[PDB]
Amino acid sequence: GLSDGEWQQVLNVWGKVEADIAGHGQEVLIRLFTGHPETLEKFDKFKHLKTEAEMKASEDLKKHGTVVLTALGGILKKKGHHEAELKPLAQSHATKHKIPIKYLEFISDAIIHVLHSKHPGDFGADAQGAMTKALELFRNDIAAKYKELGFQ
Ligand code: HEM
Protein backbone atom coordinates (compact mmCIF):
# COMPACT_ATOMS: atom_id res chain seq x y z
CA GLY A 1 0.00 0.00 0.00
CA LEU A 2 1.40 3.30 -1.24
CA SER A 3 0.14 6.82 -0.71
CA ASP A 4 -0.62 9.17 -3.59
CA GLY A 5 2.62 11.02 -2.97
CA GLU A 6 4.56 7.77 -3.06
CA TRP A 7 2.98 6.73 -6.36
CA GLN A 8 3.87 10.17 -7.73
CA GLN A 9 7.50 9.50 -6.83
CA VAL A 10 7.41 6.06 -8.46
CA LEU A 11 6.05 7.43 -11.70
CA ASN A 12 8.54 10.30 -11.65
CA VAL A 13 11.40 7.81 -11.34
CA TRP A 14 9.84 5.72 -14.08
CA GLY A 15 10.13 8.68 -16.46
CA LYS A 16 13.90 8.21 -16.24
CA VAL A 17 13.49 4.59 -17.31
CA GLU A 18 11.14 5.40 -20.19
CA ALA A 19 13.68 7.80 -21.72
CA ASP A 20 15.96 4.81 -22.41
CA ILE A 21 14.00 1.62 -21.79
CA ALA A 22 16.39 -0.65 -23.67
CA GLY A 23 19.51 0.65 -21.94
CA HIS A 24 17.92 0.37 -18.50
CA GLY A 25 16.53 -3.08 -19.29
CA GLN A 26 19.88 -4.29 -20.56
CA GLU A 27 21.69 -3.12 -17.44
CA VAL A 28 19.08 -4.61 -15.10
CA LEU A 29 19.46 -8.01 -16.71
CA ILE A 30 23.26 -7.79 -16.73
CA ARG A 31 23.28 -6.89 -13.03
CA LEU A 32 21.01 -9.88 -12.31
CA PHE A 33 23.01 -12.37 -14.38
CA THR A 34 26.44 -11.29 -13.16
CA GLY A 35 25.44 -10.91 -9.52
CA HIS A 36 23.43 -14.16 -9.43
CA PRO A 37 24.70 -16.51 -12.17
CA GLU A 38 22.20 -19.22 -11.25
CA THR A 39 19.53 -16.93 -12.74
CA LEU A 40 21.11 -17.22 -16.20
CA GLU A 41 20.39 -20.96 -16.15
CA LYS A 42 16.65 -20.28 -16.31
CA PHE A 43 17.06 -18.69 -19.77
CA ASP A 44 17.68 -21.20 -22.52
CA LYS A 45 18.27 -18.30 -24.91
CA PHE A 46 20.92 -16.61 -22.74
CA LYS A 47 22.74 -19.53 -21.10
CA HIS A 48 25.28 -19.42 -23.96
CA LEU A 49 26.46 -16.03 -22.71
CA LYS A 50 29.67 -16.67 -20.80
CA THR A 51 31.15 -13.18 -20.38
CA GLU A 52 29.64 -9.82 -19.61
CA ALA A 53 31.07 -8.53 -22.91
CA GLU A 54 28.93 -11.10 -24.73
CA MET A 55 25.97 -10.02 -22.59
CA LYS A 56 26.59 -6.36 -23.46
CA ALA A 57 26.89 -7.17 -27.17
CA SER A 58 23.69 -9.24 -27.25
CA GLU A 59 20.88 -7.46 -29.06
CA ASP A 60 18.42 -10.16 -28.01
CA LEU A 61 19.23 -9.51 -24.35
CA LYS A 62 18.47 -5.83 -24.87
CA LYS A 63 15.24 -6.83 -26.62
CA HIS A 64 14.23 -8.96 -23.66
CA GLY A 65 15.09 -6.13 -21.28
CA THR A 66 12.61 -3.98 -23.18
CA VAL A 67 9.91 -6.67 -22.83
CA VAL A 68 10.52 -6.99 -19.08
CA LEU A 69 10.56 -3.28 -18.30
CA THR A 70 7.57 -2.59 -20.56
CA ALA A 71 5.58 -5.11 -18.56
CA LEU A 72 6.73 -3.72 -15.21
CA GLY A 73 5.92 -0.16 -16.27
CA GLY A 74 2.41 -1.17 -17.25
CA ILE A 75 1.95 -2.69 -13.80
CA LEU A 76 3.39 0.34 -11.96
CA LYS A 77 1.14 2.73 -13.87
CA LYS A 78 -1.86 0.94 -12.35
CA LYS A 79 -0.87 2.22 -8.87
CA GLY A 80 -1.61 -1.10 -7.21
CA HIS A 81 -4.76 -1.96 -9.17
CA HIS A 82 -2.87 -4.54 -11.21
CA GLU A 83 -4.66 -7.88 -10.65
CA ALA A 84 -5.37 -8.43 -14.37
CA GLU A 85 -1.84 -7.47 -15.44
CA LEU A 86 -0.08 -9.40 -12.69
CA LYS A 87 -2.02 -12.70 -12.86
CA PRO A 88 -0.62 -13.94 -16.22
CA LEU A 89 2.93 -13.08 -15.17
CA ALA A 90 2.60 -14.88 -11.83
CA GLN A 91 1.15 -17.88 -13.64
CA SER A 92 3.79 -18.03 -16.37
CA HIS A 93 6.64 -17.50 -13.93
CA ALA A 94 5.44 -20.19 -11.53
CA THR A 95 4.25 -22.83 -14.03
CA LYS A 96 6.29 -22.37 -17.20
CA HIS A 97 9.52 -20.59 -16.27
CA LYS A 98 9.74 -21.93 -12.69
CA ILE A 99 11.20 -18.75 -11.21
CA PRO A 100 11.46 -18.81 -7.40
CA ILE A 101 10.31 -15.70 -5.58
CA LYS A 102 13.91 -15.20 -4.44
CA TYR A 103 14.89 -14.31 -8.01
CA LEU A 104 12.20 -11.61 -8.04
CA GLU A 105 13.85 -10.19 -4.92
CA PHE A 106 17.17 -10.27 -6.80
CA ILE A 107 15.79 -8.33 -9.77
CA SER A 108 14.06 -5.81 -7.50
CA ASP A 109 17.34 -4.98 -5.82
CA ALA A 110 19.02 -4.89 -9.24
CA ILE A 111 16.57 -2.22 -10.42
CA ILE A 112 17.53 -0.06 -7.42
CA HIS A 113 21.22 -0.62 -8.15
CA VAL A 114 20.90 0.36 -11.81
CA LEU A 115 18.93 3.49 -11.00
CA HIS A 116 21.72 4.71 -8.73
CA SER A 117 24.36 3.73 -11.26
CA LYS A 118 22.77 5.57 -14.19
CA HIS A 119 21.42 8.56 -12.22
CA PRO A 120 23.94 9.13 -9.40
CA GLY A 121 22.82 11.96 -7.16
CA ASP A 122 19.47 12.08 -8.95
CA PHE A 123 17.72 9.14 -7.22
CA GLY A 124 16.94 10.62 -3.83
CA ALA A 125 16.08 8.93 -0.57
CA ASP A 126 12.36 9.60 -0.96
CA ALA A 127 12.40 8.21 -4.50
CA GLN A 128 14.28 5.08 -3.39
CA GLY A 129 11.77 4.54 -0.58
CA ALA A 130 8.79 4.77 -2.89
CA MET A 131 10.30 2.60 -5.64
CA THR A 132 11.27 -0.04 -3.09
CA LYS A 133 7.74 -0.14 -1.69
CA ALA A 134 6.32 -0.47 -5.20
CA LEU A 135 8.59 -3.42 -5.99
CA GLU A 136 7.71 -5.01 -2.64
CA LEU A 137 4.01 -4.76 -3.45
CA PHE A 138 4.62 -6.30 -6.87
CA ARG A 139 6.61 -9.16 -5.34
CA ASN A 140 4.10 -9.66 -2.53
CA ASP A 141 1.15 -9.99 -4.89
CA ILE A 142 3.13 -12.47 -6.99
CA ALA A 143 3.94 -14.37 -3.78
CA ALA A 144 0.25 -14.72 -3.00
CA LYS A 145 -0.37 -16.32 -6.39
CA TYR A 146 2.65 -18.58 -5.93
CA LYS A 147 1.17 -19.78 -2.62
CA GLU A 148 -2.17 -20.49 -4.28
CA LEU A 149 -0.31 -22.65 -6.85
CA GLY A 150 1.88 -24.35 -4.25
CA PHE A 151 4.98 -23.23 -6.11
CA GLN A 152 8.28 -22.96 -4.29
C1 HEM B 1 10.37 -7.31 -12.92
C2 HEM B 1 10.18 -8.62 -12.96
C3 HEM B 1 9.89 -9.33 -14.22
C4 HEM B 1 8.99 -9.04 -15.21
C5 HEM B 1 7.97 -7.91 -15.23
C6 HEM B 1 9.08 -10.08 -16.17
C7 HEM B 1 8.32 -10.08 -17.35
C8 HEM B 1 8.35 -11.07 -18.32
C9 HEM B 1 7.63 -11.09 -19.55
C10 HEM B 1 6.65 -10.00 -19.99
C11 HEM B 1 7.94 -12.23 -20.20
C12 HEM B 1 7.35 -12.74 -21.49
C13 HEM B 1 5.92 -13.28 -21.33
C14 HEM B 1 5.83 -14.40 -20.33
O15 HEM B 1 6.47 -15.44 -20.57
O16 HEM B 1 5.06 -14.28 -19.33
C17 HEM B 1 9.00 -12.85 -19.45
C18 HEM B 1 9.62 -14.02 -19.85
C19 HEM B 1 10.53 -14.68 -19.04
N20 HEM B 1 10.85 -14.37 -17.75
FE21 HEM B 1 10.31 -12.83 -16.73
N22 HEM B 1 9.95 -11.02 -15.74
C23 HEM B 1 10.46 -10.65 -14.56
C24 HEM B 1 11.42 -11.30 -13.78
C25 HEM B 1 12.06 -12.47 -14.16
C26 HEM B 1 13.10 -13.13 -13.46
C27 HEM B 1 13.70 -12.66 -12.15
C28 HEM B 1 13.45 -14.26 -14.18
C29 HEM B 1 14.54 -15.25 -13.97
C30 HEM B 1 15.54 -15.09 -13.12
C31 HEM B 1 12.62 -14.28 -15.34
C32 HEM B 1 12.62 -15.28 -16.27
C33 HEM B 1 11.85 -15.25 -17.43
C34 HEM B 1 12.06 -16.24 -18.50
C35 HEM B 1 12.87 -17.51 -18.35
C36 HEM B 1 11.28 -15.87 -19.52
C37 HEM B 1 11.16 -16.57 -20.86
C38 HEM B 1 12.20 -16.00 -21.82
C39 HEM B 1 12.09 -16.65 -23.17
O40 HEM B 1 12.62 -17.76 -23.35
O41 HEM B 1 11.87 -15.95 -24.17
N42 HEM B 1 11.71 -13.25 -15.24
N43 HEM B 1 9.17 -12.18 -18.25
Could you give all domains of the chain from N- to C-terminal order, each with its CATH number?
1-152 (1.10.490.10)
Pocket test for ligand 1, best of 34, 38, 48, 68 (most atoms within 8 A of CB): 68
Q: What experiment produced this structure?
A: X-ray
Nearest residue to 125 (alpha-carbon basis) of 76, 2, 133? 133
Alpha carbons 143 and 141: distance in angstroms, whole number: 5
CA 59 to chain CA centroid, Å, is 19
Binding site, annotated residues for O2: 64
Cβ pair 8, 133 in contact under 8 A: no
Nearest residue to 118 (alpha-carbon basis) of 46, 10, 22? 22
Q: Ligand 1 mean position to 75 CA, how many Å?
A: 14
Alpha carbons 66 and 134: distance in angstroms, whole number: 19
DSSP H helical ranges for 19-124 = 21-35, 52-57, 59-76, 83-95, 101-118
Resolution (A): 1.4
